[PDB]
């Protein structure tokens, strides 16, 4: 995601600033050179970025490089990525509420009988 957000036209030779961590993404094969500044960079993303030839700054190094933050690209990972945000919204068992319920296990006989079958009772 930092690749495709730094490949957008125009923002070349800029430093990708993050406030969280820069995890690896094993399902990407080519890595360009990137100037990056984050709080953490996992020990398998330091490898890829440095073998590519990019720099990995810190927030103090960034504050010395560009105090006013000129030449940067603020980013932030997906916030609704957490599995928590799938139970939020309209409660389940409600017309057009694709919200995930809290169930011990998922299977044939765990909340599949009445409020889901048009046969047994109804469905929403």
């Amino acid at each position: 995601r930092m690749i495709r957000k730094m490949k957008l036209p125009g923002r070349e030779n800029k430093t990708a600033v993050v406030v969280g961590t820069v995890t690896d993404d094993v399902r990407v094969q080519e890595v360009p050179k990137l100037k990056v500044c984050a709080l953490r960079v996992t020990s398998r993303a330091r490898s890829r970025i440095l073998k590519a030839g990019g720099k990995i700054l810190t927030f103090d190094q960034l504050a010395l490089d560009s105090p006013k933050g000129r030449g940067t690209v603020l980013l932030s990972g997906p916030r609704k990525g957490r599995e928590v945000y799938r139970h939020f919204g309209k409660a389940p068992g409600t017309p057009h509420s694709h919200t995930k319920p809290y169930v011990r296990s998922k299977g044939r006989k765990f909340e599949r009988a009445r409020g889901r079958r048009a046969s047994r009772g109804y469905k929403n």
Partner: protein, 210 residues
């Protein structure tokens, strides 16, 4: 009463469970008891392997695990007969023997024969009478350089054959795998009824003759 949103959780605490509570405060006091009796045993059997008799190489059942290899219970009497070791004398040189094992394949029977050869060759035997050597007995030069082997004897390690990079032929690129799976699955789900429908095609079209 249930709250707004949560699980329907069933706690299995409707029996007098406080009576039958098992606490593990003696877990460190039994790890030392086991380790102590494990070195009293590794001192009672002085040069014999500390882990005990050698165990065979054994595939596992249950397609979940039928690609790993394991250490069985004993060497089947077939593998002992092939290796030439009497089933009642094997147990006295630290070879494990269980009679219950069969041997349907051969690639494993020869693996366990090669295993017995690799053990009956590393075996340092001490003479029954100390002050007098015997015929089938390692010479006195070994016995002084005979130590107690720690850990399992001839440990079993899952290996994988390294296959080098080939070049793909036009018979390999021609192979539609998914169609072959859906076809073999159909030709197996339908084999019985096809054979019966053809027994009927052959039981009717004969009546026309007589």
């Amino acid at each position: 009463a249930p709250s707004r949103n949560g699980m329907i959780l069933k706690p299995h605490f409707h029996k007098d469970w406080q009576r039958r509570v098992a606490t593990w405060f003696n877990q460190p006091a039994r790890k030392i008891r086991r380790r102590k009796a494990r070195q009293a045993r590794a001192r009672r059997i002085a040069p014999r392997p500390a882990a005990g008799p050698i165990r065979p190489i054994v595939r596992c059942p249950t397609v979940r695990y039928h690609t790993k290899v394991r250490a069985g219970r004993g060497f089947s009497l077939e593998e002992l007969r092939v290796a030439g070791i009497h089933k009642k004398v094997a147990r006295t040189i630290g070879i494990s023997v269980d009679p219950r094992r069969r041997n349907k394949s051969t690639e494993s029977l020869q693996a366990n024969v090669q295993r017995l050869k690799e053990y009956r060759s590393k075996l340092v035997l001490f003479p029954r009478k100390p002050s007098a050597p015997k015929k089938g007995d390692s010479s006195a030069e070994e016995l002084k350089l005979a130590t107690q082997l720690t850990g399992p004897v001839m440990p079993i390690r899952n290996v994988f054959k390294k296959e080098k990079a080939r070049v793909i032929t036009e018979e390999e690129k021609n192979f539609k795998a998914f169609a072959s799976l859906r076809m073999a699955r159909a030709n197996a789900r339908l084999f019985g009824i096809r054979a019966k429908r053809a027994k009927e095609a052959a039981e009717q079209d004969v009546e026309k003759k007589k």
